[PDB]
Structures are given as C-alpha cells and as structure tokens.
Nucleic acid binder design. Structure first.
Ligand SMILES: [Zn+2]
Lengths: 143, 137, 49, 199, 70, 100, 183, 63, 67, 145
RNA sequence: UAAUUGCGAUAACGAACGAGACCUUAACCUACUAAAUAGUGGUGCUAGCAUUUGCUGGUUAUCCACUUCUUAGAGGGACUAUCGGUUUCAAGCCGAUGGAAGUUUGAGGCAAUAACAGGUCUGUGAUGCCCUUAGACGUUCUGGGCCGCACGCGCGCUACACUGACGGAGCCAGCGAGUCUAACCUUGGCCGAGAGGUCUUGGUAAUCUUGUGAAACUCCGUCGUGCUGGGGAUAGAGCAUUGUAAUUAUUGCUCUUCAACGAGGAAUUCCUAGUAAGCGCAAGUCAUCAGCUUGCGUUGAUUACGUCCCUGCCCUUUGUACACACC
C-alpha cells in the first residue's frame, strides 16, 4: 500500500537488490573482480569475489534513488574510509575512482540511470520502478 | 503545528498535522531509524503516553547537524514537542497538560533542549581543560 | 647573475621588516607575525576573546 | 490486550509493553527488590527504564549521580580502557547481551539478580593509610561493586575464548549466587581481609 | 588450532549429546567444552539453529544466544 | 525604473546599521517596492599567533579577530533615484556596491 | 573578494598611518583622517606640502590623480622636547600637568632607558584617575608607545590618558559602574 | 561475619591528613538510644544506613 | 561566586535608605524601578542591584538590619 | 559446512614450494607462510585458480596445489597483473618477475651486493649497516640488538 | 568568597586602582524587524508505488505566502528566584521546586602598586659601543649541513589485540579556507588498479568545493584465539606528481619479511561534565610533505563535591650586624 525503498533501510534491501542483480544474469563486470581493493585505503579486497561488485551497484543505485543526482567524486568520498598510514595517525582516504565510475557506467548501460543538466546522474524512470518493485518484494518476503 | 528540537548540535524539525497515524523520521518509518539500540529511545516519546494513542496525527521530521545518537535525541524531542504543540493548539489544553505530566515524569530532556555545549579548547593543551604534559623535572 | 626565486622565502617577505620568518600569508596580509602583533589594531584586527 | 493500530507498520512486540505492568523490552522490572536496606536509594530501579542510554546531567552536583539507573551505571563502568572510551553503543550492546545471557542461564529475574550481585559485591569496610580500618558509605559500596565487576569482566575477557558479555554475565552469576571463585568477590574479600588486623 | 580443528568425529556422538549438562550454547562454549574449534563453530551452530533442539533469541552477530526447546 | 541590488559590507556595526536602516526610509519616502534587508552571516577572521617574538615562556597563543558584516537589499527605482541613493551613501567605513 | 578587500583597506590604513607619522612628524602629526596638532602647516605655503604628499601617495599606491588631548600628539611633542634638549623629569612632569589641566581625567607617563648609564630604570609620572585595565580602557583611554633616539641609547616612552567620560559626546557618558540616583 | 545496620544522624566533618575519611555519628536501628562515631571514606548524607561488623569500637578523629 | 560587591551592596543601601516607601519585595518591580530612578548603565549591574535590594527588603520584614 | 570426515584426505603440515605449510590454516594465510608470498598476493592467485577460499591447503586439493605453484612461478602469463608483482625491470632485463621460492632473499642479497659494488651512497650506508631509507638513528634504532 | 568578595569585629570613617564591574562567545526567544546569497508549506513542471489519492519525491528565473528550522539588528530573560534548613547576627552555603540555564550560567579577552640581571640585539630601516668593509662578518651563486649514531632525556603517533582485525554495508557534523593581473578550493564527465593526468565547470564566495556523502561508530559475515590475519618497524622492485633540483627514501601508490611490543620497575604527567578519554575535520607554516600546533565538531565515563599528606606560592608572625638589600 504505497511502498518505496524507504521502508527497508540498510541491510535487507541490499541483500535483495544484490540477489536480484545476481539472478538477472546481466554481468556488467569490467573484470576488476579479484584485482582491486575497492579503495586505496584498504589492506585486502572483499572476501567473496562473487557479490562485491553487485553490492556496490546496489548501494549506488539505492543512494542515487534516495537522494538527488550525485557524482563519481561524491560516491568516491562516500565509499572511501580510513587508512593505516603506517606509524602515522589514520586518515580518510578516497576510494578507487575507476571502480565507482565503472559501476555507474554499467548502470547507465543498463539504462536505469540518466545524466543531470547540472552534473551527476539521477535514477531513471525504469530504475526507480525496479527499485520500488524490489522494495515491495522485500517487504512481502522478509519483514 | 511545527516544532524543532536539539540535543548537542543536531536540530530536528517536525511538522504535525491532522492525518492518519504516520510518523516518519527521515523518510523511513520509525521502525528503521536504526541506531540498533536506540530504536526504543525513539519509541519512547510515543510509547510513554499510550500504546499508539494516536491514529489521527501525522508527524514528519527532518534532522541534521550532529551525530547518530544526537540526531536520535533531537528527533525524539522534536516529535514529542510537536505532539505537545498539537494538543496545545487543537486537541485540548487539559490533554496537553496530562501528557506534559507524563513527559516530565519520564523526563529525558524530551521537552527542554539540553544546554550541554562543547566548551572552547584553550591554547597549550589538547582539549579545553586538560593541558599538554610537562616533565621538565 | 640571479637564479630564479619565484617560490619560497626568497620570494616572500614581510613588507615591513623584510623577514622571511613569521610571515602571515593569510587573508592577503603578507606581513610578519611580530609586526602583525605590534601594528595589528591599526589593520582592524581587534582583541575580543 | 486492546492492540491499537496506526498507519505505519510497527510490530506488536513494543505495543504489548505498558498496558500491563511496566517492564523492560524483554525482562521484568517491577519484581526487583534490593536484598539489603543500606543500598536503597543508591540503585535506581523503580522507576523503570527503556534502555541504558539516559544521557543526562549527572555530574553537576554531589548526589545527582546516585539517581542513575543501575544498568546505565554498568554501561558507564564498561566505558573505560581508553581503547573502549566512548563507544557507549558498544557498551550498551554488551550490557544487553549480558542481560540475555543472565536470562538464558539461571534467569532469576536478571536485573534483580544483577542488583543482588552488586549489593553482595559492595565492600562493606576498607582501610586508609594513616593503615586504619574505616567503614564504607553505601554510595562507595555501589560504585566499587560496579567498578570491580567491570574490571573483573575486562581482566577475564582478556586472553580467553569467552567474550566480554559472556564473562561479565557469568561473573555476575557467581557474585549473585555468593561464590568465592569470582574476581569481584575475591577482591572484596581482600578488602575485608584487613578488618581485624587494622581495626 | 590445537584441538578439534575441522574433524569433530573422534567423539562424533558429541554432535548430538550436547544439549544436556549446560543450558547455554555459544561459539565460546563450543571451544570450551572440548567439542568444536573456532574455525567452523559458527557454521556448526548455524546448522543447529537451522534444525535442532536449540532456538535462537535474536539475530546476534559476534555472539550467540540460544536456548533449548521448551 | 530599473532593478538594483545594494550591498553593504563593513566592520563598524554602528555605521553599517545607520546606513542599511536609512536606506529603507529613503525608499519608503518615495514609496518604492523592495525586498527587505538581508543579513548575510557575520564572518570572523580569527587568526591565532604567538605572543612573544622568541621561544621563551609558557606556550600562550593569542587570537586576533576581524568581524566582517555585510547586508543586501533589492530595490526598484529609476536612474535618478538610483544615483540619489548611491550619492547619499558616502559614509566613511562602509563599502557600498550597487549592481543593476 | 570582500574579506581580502577590507584586509587590504586595513593594511593600506596602516601604511598611511606609518608613512604620515614618519614624514609629517615635523608638523606635529597625530593621526590620519590627516590630523596635526596645528592645522595651518597642513596647508603650508598655500597647499605645497599637501600637494607633494598627495603626489607621493598616488605614486606609491597606484592611485588616480583626481579619484592637545591626543596621547600620540603629546607623546611626539615630548619626544621632540627631549630630542632638542630639556630635563627629562621636568618634561614628563610638564606633560602630565598639562594633560591634567586640559580636562583629561588622569594621565600616566612612563620613561624607560639609559637616562644615565646604569641598569636602565623606569621613571614614572602618574596623576589623576586611571583604570587599567578592562573593556573601559579601550572605551576611554588613549595610549601611545614611542622610541626616543638620542645620541646615546633609546628611551621607551608610554603615555596613557584617561579621557573624561562625562565629556564623551558619543557612546556611554558615564563610568560603567557609576550609579547615581535623585531624591 | 557479624552484621548490624544503623543510620547516620549527624555528619561531623572531614578527617585525616589528606581529607578523605570522615567522622559521622550513627544511631543504630535496633536499640536506637545509642549513637557511635564512625570513619567513612565515601560520601554520606542524612537518613543513610551503614553496615558494620563490629558494634562497639569508637573510631576517634584521625589526625 | 554568588557574593555581591561593594559597588552593588552600598548602591542598594543608598537606594533603599531613601526609597523604602517604594518598591516592594518583587524582583521585577524592583528592577523596573531601578531603571526608573537610577541611571545604572548595565543590565547585569541593574539585575544584581534589583536582586540585592529585593533581598534587603525581604529580610527587613524579619527585623531591622544594620546600616 | 559439509561432510568432511576425510579419513584419508586430510593433510597435516605439508611441503610446498621450498617451505613447510601449516595445514590448520586456510589456503591464503597458509601460503603466506612461504617467504615471498603474502596475504593479498595469495588471495589474488587463489581466486585466479578459482579454488574454494574457505578451505585450507590441507583439504583443498592435491593437484591444484601444484597448479598454484605453477601460476606463482609464472605470474605474467597465468592471469596476474604486471603491477601486482614485486619485481619489474630487475636489474638488466626490463621484463617483470616475481620470485616466489627460497630465492627472493637471494635476489635481495644480489641487489644489495651490486648496489654496494657500484660504490653508491646507498651502498656504503648498507655496508656500514646503518639506516639507508633516510631514517634517523640519533634516538631511534639505537641498540638494535 | 574565585577574590582586600563580603559579613562581622572593631580608633576608625568614608573612599580610589586592581578583583568584580566591562566586553567577546555558547546556551533561549511558537516574542519584534527581513530574507532564490537560508529554510518551510499550497498550487501546474511529480517519473515510481499505491490507484479515492495517499509516502519518498526532481523541477535552482517554477508562482504565492510564511520565518517555526538558519541567519543578525534593536531588545527580553538569571538577579541564585521561591520554599525549608544551616546559618556568630549576616555575608554565604545546603536540598527540592520552577527555570533555558543556579560551579562567577559554561568558557575566555582585558587585567593593578612593582620586581626578575627571565628570553629576544638571530623580527624590526629599534638602538649606544666596537668589529667588518671590496681576499668582507654586505649581497649573490654551486655542493653539503642542521637528518648525521658507542649513548642519555623529554613531548608525541602507531601500537601490544575477540569491547579485536579484515571486508562490505548504513551516511552524521562544526571552525573555517579559497583566483580579477590568475592559477586557489575544485564539482561533473574521460583514462588509469592505485597514485596521478585529461575535457571542462562553479565559486572574488550562506550561492561553488560544501550537505566537507569524515572518522570514530551501527549492522552483517570470516578470522579463533595463535607474535597470527594486531604492528608495518625493516629493505628491495616498480608506478607519478610537487619541485629548474627527491641521491642524503619529500610524499603517495601495488607487491614482497611480518621485527620489537605478550599490559610496562622505581617512578611520573594532565584532569572534576559535554571536561577526561577515543575519533576525525579545517587553518598556520605550503611550489610538496604532520606524527607539530591553533580552532572545530562526533561518542561521552569513573571517582570527589574536599584537604593540607607532599609540591608550589601568598599572607601573617618572628630574627637580622642585610638597605648595592644573601649574588
Ligand atoms: Zn614583519
């Protein structure tokens, strides 16, 4: 009864949309799996090779639907964490630009995302439709 | 009608209107504010007076300015004060009074904004009151 | 004759004492930290807190 | 009992709370009576509390700290070590997990058992270097019980399989049941060892 | 590592005769009562929470809260 | 009649207000239409420095502050009223800028 | 910009103050408005000095050609008195008494340095009422620090005046603590 | 361990070289017509109850 | 702390010595009367003077005081 | 996770690539035990071989272990990035290697000896046994026992 | 009492500077003034879901009004207010209530009569005397040096691990800084794994970076209790920018060894509530580099609400052959 992606907040929505992208079969993977750290400030790449890219795509789609158009730099800032710089104090280090750029380009290629006249990219009509359907299915499957 | 609430620096502005029992926090329902331990801290300004006790009021709040628990405190204060204002202006002054009594009998800075502000940090030492260390001898 | 000094303390100095140390390159001052403290209130910098 | 409903989806797990006797989210609060008459008004059960996060003014005056809920006293005591400084959310998660562990192992009204353990671990007499045997105020008894429980939990969860929640919960069980195999009770016994030799 | 790394079939009857003698089961309890090492204890308790006599109390992570069937 | 925006910046609050408030009456005496005076937040130019010219004594830092305050108004007036309102405002110490 | 623009205006004010104090000392300078103890040599020989100063200031600042009670004033006058020759203690006493009879509510002159070779002492002359310090010192006090360069050594002279709060004519007209009632 | 509970009826003042111990007159709940002075380190207010192993050992001021 | 100075106490005495048939034991009326008959040039000092005069008048109902 | 009785397919401490491997640790961190191979390199090579990451070298396979050895000794050919290896343009060849054996230490010794024999500042500091990477011995690394 | 703050006692009375008072700031103000350089609601530009219409919702020249949220001007409020008790008689203090806040409301700026052989001539085109002065101790250029290592000391970051590490995953700040004589903060696309470069674009600034999409932290999994997967100390190989110049690692990046550290002796520093501590942010130095400092904010305790045991200083008394005053 009038459900959006703002009725599953943080974990079940991601576990639902990543699984949906897995079942969809469309890969959109540029080959970065098992080769990249997902940021310059980490120590090791994600544990499971199958799933991290799809979860990245799920996160960026959900973020760009919950808020307005946002850019590769904004996603890099959001996904960049701290870094053990040695014996120096920890520091915020931005993520790998290429991975976020390629995830957004993959979303554009699928067509769920369009550009904005001011800069950045916003979720498309079909993208928002798919995300709302995913939310409704998540509510109807696991409360 | 409209109220605001703060704990340290986060301000939450809540609009309460005649609607159908819809209480939002940032677009998500009150079940998913997700501090994952203060999900009952946010429930408190509604569970206190009554189980639901309100299916005719709609509260939409938007919070920014502080941290996670600061914004939780800000929203739980703002929605309670919005409820107080709504009863003050429309429902009844008596009803406002008995719900203020319950709010003050469970007072958690729910109605009065906390005045604890970070004190300015002075030269010669990290922190406002702690000073650097000297051994000299 | 003269090697380039387009950067650094050979490039910048206090417009008053010509000191390369204590220079305040903030807000467009380009003036030393000691000349600043001496002739500060004449610039508009007051002591309030 | 009269399950009122509003528009937004919310479970009855919170909606069943205060129509009956006021209670915690999982554990009975009204069936809690301190086993002594000295520490009364130094614990802060009855009133009951929704969760141990009453972030209020409690250090302005001398005895305005004593009116803090005993669960939040426990959380604030776990709030130490510098590495665990801050992280009140973490500390309250451990405290909730300990409450669940006390429920599962010898439930015994877990908050009532915790207040009984604190009363039993409050050192009744100490010594001051003048060494003279002096008596302990009930506030000091409560504070030392909380601090000893926390430090024992820390020094037991150090270098072991058991997690901090599990070890603090088990130690609280020993303290409540009255065994001298617990670190807090053993330190209380050390403090009480100078009772005749320094009197 | 030092005991019961992956096998846990030297005493393979202890995968069933474990409910009694203690009302609580956890990742630490598995390492403590000479039964399971921590290299697979989480999934060994996952199996028992999926089907068995222990029922979980929450969606706990980094910890476990299980109680026997009433 | 043309539309203009008048901007006042200063450090002296007394003269800044003495100008921004007579502008309102100068407009009303000719019965003009204007958006109210807006106060863009005062910005402090606080800068910390070391008191002594050397390295002796306890580490004591003193800050100097320059508070800059500045307002803006929208007005609609002919060229004659525009030149009049920009000519009366020659108060020494407040910077006044008129854009069209 | 705006912050940079007004900072530039402030340093330009400091430049004007320093240059005018150094150059127009012989005319008895007090502060840039310009203000001199006598307003007649400001015009001089029907504008010659001021025209020369305008030309110099234009050349420096890249400008278009066509676009008694003061603490600093008395400090520089007494500097001139010491430099051209007068007893130092007598000069300080004369300055303080002159400021005192000129209506000022309090004066203090401190002279430090090598009067005669020693370990350099500080000789003071304080008369009337003085408050130091607080906010009211910025409110009503005029202070000046001056360096006297004689043939031997340098003397530091600090002159402080507590101007009469009654004859203020701007801002508060009495003391912050002054409480007076009528009956 | 003998157990007897009493209630403070008079706080005298601070005590000791460092000022950490405190003399308090305490009246026993049982046989209330008897007030003895005790040394306590933690804060004590009125109508508060102390527990003491020994009954009659008059703790005097600690200089 | 919360102790009053001479410039407040003696001024309050000077007001009350000639304005007893005057401002009552109410702090608001006392402070407004301070604005009325006293050219006190600070809100802080005005409030302090009003409070101390209020205390003096309140304690005068329990017996005359010195001075 | 599964029926792992493995009466005959469980391995204790084994032998692999000139270094004993502890059989009670997983494949990544047990391959990290060999001098020359670390955590992330082992993770990348194991995910390239597409073996299960959640099992240990004791029960993983017996032939894919030699496969992992082969891909480690031939990194550039068997799906490994050139930037992901420790040695490009070794001293004289310009092609990229990665010594994963009991030879990376030997390569380091040879680098040190040639850098010393070429009579460089780094070489003479290395011969003197002091810090060479600009580190300060005034107060730090003093005893070095 | 923070106070020579005040009460009181009293050959004193009445006073003055300093302290207070003053000002700055951080708290509040459903009160006034005004806001597409800020924010909120009613209408068309609203695509999704649900279809009796309701939730998120873009539309920055898309109209209207408003100022509750933000801003800043006049002003208001707190003055310890009321009530009990303690109070020499009072200054004050203690509890509760109200309060926006009751430890000077929190924190600072200013801060006297004076003294130091305290530091600075290595800031000053501040300066007495001397030196130097054309093989210069003036200026300037080339290289090093301040970094150096048998050793000792101090302020610090990382640290020694399951309240943890690693991955995703949730996305929350505040002080501010920024180029019109031009290369500053950089948004959005492009390339690159990364560093970094590329097309521009916005900002002379509440407009743009910037909502600083920060960390700490929450959630979910693995790691299993090990010198290990904490630590990246230690060196090598390669990858670029800053820099006319990275050799005597500026710095960042990927890989490679995971070394000491397994809780620290006698000792010893800072500190009483938004303070300790943990965490990060901005600014000064900057052509580039923080572990430094100056401000800022997020999470937010324990103990006590005092004493002279030590340490430091003040006062008083007291001795003096000191008065250049114990050098
Ligand atoms: Zn200078």
């Amino acid at each position: 009864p009038g459900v959006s992606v703002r009725d599953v907040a943080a974990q079940d929505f991601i576990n639902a949309y990543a699984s949906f992208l897995q079942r969809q079969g469309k890969l959109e993977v540029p080959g970065y799996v098992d080769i990249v750290k997902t940021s310059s400030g980490n120590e090791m790449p994600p544990q499971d090779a199958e799933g991290w890219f799809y979860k990245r795509a799920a996160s960026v789609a959900r973020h760009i639907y919950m808020r307005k158009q946002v850019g590769v730099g904004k996603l890099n800032k959001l996904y960049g964490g701290a870094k053990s710089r040695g014996v120096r104090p920890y520091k915020h280090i931005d993520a790998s630009g290429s991975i976020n750029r390629k995830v957004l380009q993959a979303l554009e290629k699928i067509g769920i995302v369009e550009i904005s006249p001011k800069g950045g990219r916003r979720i498309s009509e079909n993208g928002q439709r798919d995300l709302d359907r995913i939310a409704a299915q998540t509510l109807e499957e696991d409360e | 009608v409209q109220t605001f609430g703060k704990k340290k620096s986060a301000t939450a502005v809540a609009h309460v209107k005649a609607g159908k029992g819809l209480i939002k926090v940032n677009g998500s329902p009150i079940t998913l504010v997700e501090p994952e331990i203060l999900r009952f801290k946010v429930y408190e300004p509604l569970l206190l007076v009554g189980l639901d006790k309100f299916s005719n009021i709609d509260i939409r709040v938007r919070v920014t300015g502080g941290g996670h628990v600061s914004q939780v405190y800000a929203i739980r204060q703002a929605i309670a004060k919005g409820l107080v204002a709504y009863h003050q202006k429309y429902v009844d002054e008596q009803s406002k009074n008995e719900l203020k009594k319950a709010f003050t009998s469970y007072d958690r800075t729910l109605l009065i904004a906390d005045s604890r502000r970070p004190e300015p940090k002075k030269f010669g030492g990290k922190g406002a009151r702690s000073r650097f260390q000297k051994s000299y001898r | 004759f003269s090697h380039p000094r387009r950067y650094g303390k050979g490039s910048r100095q206090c417009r008053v004492c010509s000191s390369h140390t204590g220079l305040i390159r903030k807000y467009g001052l380009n003036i030393c930290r000691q000349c600043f403290r001496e002739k500060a209130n004449d610039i508009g910098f007051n002591k309030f807190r | 009992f009269t399950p009122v409903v509003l528009a937004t989806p919310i479970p009855e797990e919170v909606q069943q709370a205060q129509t009956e006797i006021k209670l915690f989210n999982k554990w009975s609060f009204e069936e809690v009576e301190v086993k002594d008459a000295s520490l009364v008004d130094y614990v802060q059960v009855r009133q009951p509390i929704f969760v141990a996060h009453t972030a209020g003014r409690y250090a302005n005056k001398r005895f305005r700290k004593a009116q803090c809920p005993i669960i939040e006293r426990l959380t604030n005591s776990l709030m130490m070590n510098g590495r665990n400084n801050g992280k009140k959310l973490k500390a309250v998660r451990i405290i909730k997990h300990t409450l669940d562990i006390i429920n599962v192992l010898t439930d015994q009204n877990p908050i009532q058992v915790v207040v009984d353990a604190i009363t039993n671990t409050g050192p009744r007499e100490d010594t001051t270097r003048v060494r003279q045997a002096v008596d302990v105020s009930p506030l000091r008894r409560v504070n030392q019980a909380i601090a000893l429980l926390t430090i024992g939990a820390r020094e037991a969860a150090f270098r072991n399989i058991k997690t901090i929640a599990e070890t603090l919960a088990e130690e609280l069980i020993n303290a409540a049941k009255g065994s001298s195999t617990s670190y807090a009770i053993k330190k209380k016994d050390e403090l009480e060892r100078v009772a005749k030799s320094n009197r | 590592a030092q005991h019961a790394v992956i096998l846990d079939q030297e005493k393979y009857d202890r995968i069933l005769k474990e409910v009694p003698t203690y009302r609580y089961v956890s990742v630490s309890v598995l390492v403590d009562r000479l039964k399971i090492g921590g290299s697979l204890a989480r999934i060994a308790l996952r199996h028992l929470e999926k089907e068995g006599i222990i029922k979980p109390i929450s969606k706990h992570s980094k910890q476990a809260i299980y109680t026997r069937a009433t | 009649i043309i539309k203009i925006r008048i901007t006042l910046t200063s450090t002296k609050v007394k003269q800044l207000e003495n100008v921004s408030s007579n502008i309102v009456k100068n407009a009303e005496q000719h019965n003009l239409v204007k958006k109210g005076p807006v106060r863009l937040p005062t910005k402090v130019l606080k800068i910390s420095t070391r008191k002594t010219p050397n390295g002796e004594g306890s580490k004591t830092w003193e800050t100097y502050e320059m508070r800059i305050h500045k307002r803006y108004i929208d007005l609609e007036a002919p060229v004659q009223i525009v030149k009049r309102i920009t000519q009366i405002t020659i108060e020494p110490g407040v910077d006044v800028e008129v854009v069209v | 910009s705006k912050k940079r623009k007004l900072v530039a205006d402030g340093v330009f004010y400091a430049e004007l103050n320093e240059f005018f104090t150094r150059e127009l000392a012989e005319e008895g300078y007090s502060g840039v408005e310009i203000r001199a103890t006598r307003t007649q040599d400001v015009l001089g020989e029907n504008g010659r000095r001021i025209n020369e100063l305008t030309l110099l200031v234009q050349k420096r600042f890249k400008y278009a050609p066509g676009t008694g009670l003061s603490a600093v004033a008395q400090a520089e006058s007494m500097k001139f008195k010491l430099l051209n020759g007068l007893a130092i203690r007598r000069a300080a006493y004369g300055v303080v008494r002159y400021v005192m009879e000129s209506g000022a509510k309090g004066c203090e002159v401190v002279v430090s340095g090598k009067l005669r070779a020693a370990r350099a002492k500080a000789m003071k002359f304080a008369d009337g009422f003085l408050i130091h310090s607080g906010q009211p010192v910025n409110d009503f006090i005029d202070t000046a620090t001056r360096h006297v360069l004689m043939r031997q050594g340098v003397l530091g002279i600090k002159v402080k005046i507590m101007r009469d709060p009654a004859k203020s004519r701007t801002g508060p007209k009495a003391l912050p603590d002054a409480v007076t009632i009528i009956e | 361990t003998p157990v007897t509970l009493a209630k403070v009826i008079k706080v005298l003042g601070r005590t000791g070289s460092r000022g950490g111990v405190t003399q308090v007159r305490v009246e026993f709940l049982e046989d209330t017509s008897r007030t003895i002075v005790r040394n306590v380190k933690g804060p004590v207010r009125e109508n508060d109850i102390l527990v003491l192993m020994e009954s009659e050992r008059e703790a005097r001021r600690l200089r | 702390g919360r102790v009053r100075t001479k410039t407040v106490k003696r001024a309050s005495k000077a007001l009350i010595e000639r304005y007893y048939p005057k401002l009552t034991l109410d702090f608001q009326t006392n402070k407004r009367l301070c604005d009325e008959i006293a050219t006190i040039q600070s809100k802080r000092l005005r409030n302090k003077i009003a409070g101390y005069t209020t205390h003096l008048m309140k304690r005068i109902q329990k017996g005359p005081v010195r001075g | 996770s599964l029926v792992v009785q493995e009466q005959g397919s469980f391995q204790h401490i084994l032998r692999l690539l000139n270094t004993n491997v502890d059989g009670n640790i997983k494949i990544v961190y047990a391959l990290t035990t060999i001098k020359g191979v670390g955590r992330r390199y082992s993770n990348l090579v194991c995910k390239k071989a597409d073996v299960d990451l959640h099992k240990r070298a004791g029960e993983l396979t017996q032939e894919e272990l030699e496969r992992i050895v082969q891909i480690m000794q031939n990194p550039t050919h068997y799906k490994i990035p050139a930037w992901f290896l420790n040695r490009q343009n070794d001293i004289t060849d310009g092609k990229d290697y990665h010594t994963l054996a009991n030879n990376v230490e030997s390569k380091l010794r040879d680098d040190l000896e040639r850098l010393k024999k070429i009579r460089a500042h780094r070489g003479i500091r290395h011969f003197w046994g002091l810090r060479v990477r600009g580190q300060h011995t005034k107060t730090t690394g003093r005893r070095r026992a």
